[PDB]
């Protein structure tokens, strides 16, 4: 037979290091590889990130447009103009193909 190794068993890392956190076999590296992963993972990304993302102001202008509507609807209604006129680019500006 062609020489090759006998199947390597998978160790019960939980037999020694009964506090195994799943990162590395020797205990101190494990502890310091979860004390830095829960922290940088949860403690300052899911928390500081969500804080910053929550405070992004008027994202994509949708906080601005609910007022500009309100003053346009305030202005258009009181002055009697149609609230959403039916052509946007004014007809006067357009130079329609004359013949057709």
């Amino acid at each position: 037979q062609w020489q090759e190794d006998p199947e390597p068993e998978d160790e019960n890392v939980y037999a020694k290091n009964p506090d195994f956190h799943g990162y590395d076999s020797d205990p101190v590296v494990d502890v310091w590889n979860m004390r830095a992963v829960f922290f940088f993972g949860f403690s300052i990304v899911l928390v500081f990130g969500t804080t910053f993302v929550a405070y992004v102001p008027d994202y994509r202008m949708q906080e601005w447009a609910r007022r500009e509507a309100e003053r346009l609807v305030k202005y258009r209604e009181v002055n009697g103009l149609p609230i959403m006129e039916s052509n946007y680019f004014d007809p006067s500006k357009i130079q329609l193909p004359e013949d057709d």
């Binding site: 062609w2 199947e7 390597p8 998978d10």
Partner: protein
């Protein structure tokens, strides 16, 4: 449990003077390693 490293048989195919050997194409056997013929 071991990413399967190639066995002898997987290796075998790459021998032979042509990868895809057809009829009267397997007749060809690999050239001498020394580059010298008998």
């Amino acid at each position: 449990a071991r990413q399967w490293q190639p066995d002898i048989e997987w290796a075998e195919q790459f021998s032979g003077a042509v990868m895809y050997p057809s009829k009267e194409t397997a007749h060809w056997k690999p050239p001498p390693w020394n580059d010298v013929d008998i």
